Amino acid sequence: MKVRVKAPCTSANLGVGFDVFGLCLKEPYDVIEVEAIDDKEIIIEVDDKNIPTDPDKNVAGIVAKKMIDDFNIGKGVKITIKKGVKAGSGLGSSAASSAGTAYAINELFKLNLDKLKLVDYASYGELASSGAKHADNVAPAIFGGFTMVTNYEPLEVLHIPIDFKLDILIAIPNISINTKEAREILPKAVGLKDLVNNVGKACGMVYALYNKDKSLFGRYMMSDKVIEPVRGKLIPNYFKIKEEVKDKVYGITISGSGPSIIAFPKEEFIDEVENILRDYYENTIRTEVGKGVEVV
Amino acid sequence: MKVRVKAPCTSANLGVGFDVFGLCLKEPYDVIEVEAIDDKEIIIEVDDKNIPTDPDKNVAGIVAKKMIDDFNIGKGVKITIKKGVKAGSGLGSSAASSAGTAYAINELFKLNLDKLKLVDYASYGELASSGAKHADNVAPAIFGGFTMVTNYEPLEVLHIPIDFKLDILIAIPNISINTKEAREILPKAVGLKDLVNNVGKACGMVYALYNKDKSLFGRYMMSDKVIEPVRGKLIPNYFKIKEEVKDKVYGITISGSGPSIIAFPKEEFIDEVENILRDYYENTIRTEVGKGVEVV
Ligand SMILES: Nc1ncnc2c1ncn2[C@@H]1O[C@H](COP(=O)(O)OP(=O)(O)NP(=O)(O)O)[C@@H](O)[C@H]1O
Ligand SMILES: Nc1ncnc2c1ncn2[C@@H]1O[C@H](COP(=O)(O)OP(=O)(O)NP(=O)(O)O)[C@@H](O)[C@H]1O
């Protein structure tokens, strides 16, 4: 019959966790409904005219087809998507559709797949714009909390639930950054010193989560000198914003490949940091860590 | 009057934790005694003729002088050292003397310094052969357990006690590897792909310790493709040994800059893995995680 879900936006990289770390947000999210239909075609409806309805281009259609073929399902599906945020925002918008679809198909056709397999299937949607199955946004979208994609072929995801309170502020510029281009501009090689720094700071962030230390987590998050300083130059007022909220947040950095900005405000300054972000970007959201795709 | 301590050998790097991770061993260790003397000179006695007695070259003398001057102590010290293992073995031999001395001076002159400051002082001994204050061996020697040096200037050390049982096997070749040379041969730059791999695998090792997962810890430890494959070529039979103990250990890798080899055998094959290591290197030791410098 049919299944409807809310599939969350996610923030990847988190500074020194480039291509590994993922943090699931509670908002924004896509609302996706999948209905089994007798005709074997896959029909897609989406409320954002800039997103393809062709089932071989829309990531939801790509993921559904792969799963339907893999299990010889024999039915088509009509997928209706209401977008939480536009693509190219650095918030895992496409991944929300890829993950939500994987989860919905799994429920609809009772495939009983585990979370890792759902992330693996969702990652095929993320391939439609990569040449490679990136899973750092679809992993948190499925698992909720904080995730680390620690291996590919085969995929490995380690999950750390966030049991404490972690306020999040997200500023969403109206401009977009194409992720392939965002990657082309990155250095092809990094110095041994940056390797040592990022490995240490990233490991420190993991220790910080197990020790519920927001200050440590946020400070190490801001120590990347390899990727963030390069991509931050694509974002108007990003460095000025970092300076203005300096002692009022545990940390602030680029969400995914940008241009969205993610900040972890200190309890005492949450309204003030939100207002500062709003001053620059009217589309600013207050949220927290999410629990992953779920039925709605 | 006088203070006598046992200062443990330590294993740094642990594969993807290059220049960050440190694991304290219970054995071998140096036995170091420090006695306050009226004359302000620093006298050093050491049972290894290949180690300098000049107080400005022996790391124990360098560390003691720095601490004595910093606190206007006004007394000299006579330091007697009985070495656990030779320098250039990849087991933090010099660091054991540096850390043991820092700890002993702190006790002898009642300086009440915390562990981090002791590691910082010990790291000045490690400077006598670096140009830089490396702390990845002195940190575990002082803290015990597993440590991560996550920042320099100022020094930051995160400590993770090892509460579970972790059997360790150490093979000590009779040859030495000069650490400065071991570093010169490393690549000056690494690919973005290796940065992603090592950050993810190193973070996975941290997660593995908090989840007491030896298999995960050991497997990720062996995923470094940047440093270990280069230095392993300096160690006779190292790759052959890895292949022979393959399914009998949680993991095996180079200790520090080598040539010593550190393995974490599975409970079922401990005698068999020790015998294999002994076949190649008569000086093989069975040990476990240590608790750091202590009085003896
Ligand atoms: N259901 C969908 N939702 C969003 N984008 C889609 C969808 N289906 C196909 N796409 C296309 O795929 C591309 C995904 O772009 P991308 O810039 O990576 O968005 P992103 O999914 O928002 N992730 P990121 O910016 O990395 O957080 C765009 O070209 C989209 O047109
Ligand atoms: N008390 C000491 N114990 C050991 N070496 C010392 C000591 N004092 C001075 N040294 C000298 O410092 C150098 C330290 O060499 P090194 O090869 O790094 O040993 P290592 O301390 O054994 N550490 P590593 O091999 O990195 O685990 C040698 O040249 C030694 O002669």
From Swiss-Prot, chains A, B:
GO terms for molecular function: ATP binding; homoserine kinase activity. It is found in: Cytoplasm. ATP binds at K86, A87, G88, S89, G90, L91, G92, S93, S94, A95, A96. The keyword ATP-binding applies. Keywords: Amino-acid biosynthesis, ATP-binding, Cytoplasm, Kinase, Nucleotide-binding, Threonine biosynthesis, Transferase. Pathway: Amino-acid biosynthesis; L-threonine biosynthesis; L-threonine from L-aspartate: step 4/5. Its main location: cytoplasm. GO terms for cellular component: cytoplasm. Catalyzes the ATP-dependent phosphorylation of L-homoserine to L-homoserine phosphate. This is Homoserine kinase. The gene is thrB.
